[PDB]
């Protein structure tokens with residue numbers, strides 16, 4: 599089962615937790631700190647896109663330190679670049695993720711409130727570093743037995759660049775469909791923080807209902823679902839969309855009215871539906887920002903600005919990775935991981 603999982607002398611006792619495209623995660627015993635950790639094997643070097651997501655996660659996570667964000671406490675790889683085929687990343691061990699919880703567990707308002715807070719608290723740190731996660735969703739939210747939440751997988755994360763956000767209509771995207779903001783299908787590259795707030799809103803809705811709020815089955819169908827609930831965008835909102843093919847598509851649509859949140863979520867806290875509304879606002883300029891969300895009445899019993907830390911060192915203009923070849927991406931992954939080598 600546990601294939602070629604070659605963590606050195608330090609980590610023993612492996613258990614298969616899960617898999618993915620180009621890697622595997624197992625639990626293991628840290629014979630140094632005596633604590634049982636999580637280790638993720640990565641085999642990305644064949645594809646440039648994988649090397650690009652591996653490099654992004656490592657640069658960022660090594661520079662981040664926050665309780666609601668997953669850490670990288672160690673990295674294991676071959677001593678030379680020629681010999682390095684895989685990379686192992688040691689990270690926090692968490693019992694489950696939110697995606698698995700929503701399948702079998704119904705969350706109490708208290709849990710929804712607490713999970714939401716921790717997501718926003720950690721998102722604040724990320725955004726304060728001028729970084730967008732860009733792939734927030736239930737499966738990227740980890741929980742332990744005492745319901746501590748940590749955000750993971752920054753393979754899609756980018757440095758904010760709102761000046762280069764505008765793009766054409768139905769422009770290709772990578773992040774998960776159900777949690778994709780409307781503007782992504784319209785005129786946005788997803789380079790503004792408002793992208794994350796939308797996903798978090800979709801996650802809030804899903805926590806109230808245990809099912810996706812906008813479960814589109816393909817690219818354009820995603821927009822249909824969102825507009826089916828939010829209704830036709832106002833004139834003022836349409837004017838913010840200057841692209842003609844995007845505006846005209848929205849104009850070609852029949853008028854639809856807003857479907858009441860309380861109609862969708864009968865048992866839901868009204869304070870929760872009010873915030874949900876602010877998060878799932880069509881216009882990304884009007885959409886609530888992370889610090890407003892934290893200060894929202896629904897999260898009153900947790901809100902504490904001084905206990906909600908921001909990044910010490912924010913990333914500057916984007917990392918320029920989209921350009922470099924696999925070969926150069928492997929070197930950068932090599933040099934970024936050097937510090938964890940005993941020969942260092």
Ligand SMILES: O=C(N[C@H](CO)c1ccc(F)c(Cl)c1)c1cc(-c2n[nH]cc2-c2cccc(Cl)c2)c[nH]1
Pocket residue numbers: 615616617618619620621622623636638640668689690691692693694695737738740750751
């Ligand atoms: O980076 C992590 N996961 C990303 C996306 O979620 C990933 C999963 C597979 C893969 F093949 C890749 Cl490339 C990326 C991660 C999870 C845990 C992690 N601690 N404790 C438990 C886990 C865990 C929970 C559920 C499922 C898994 Cl599998 C692991 C650490 N780090």
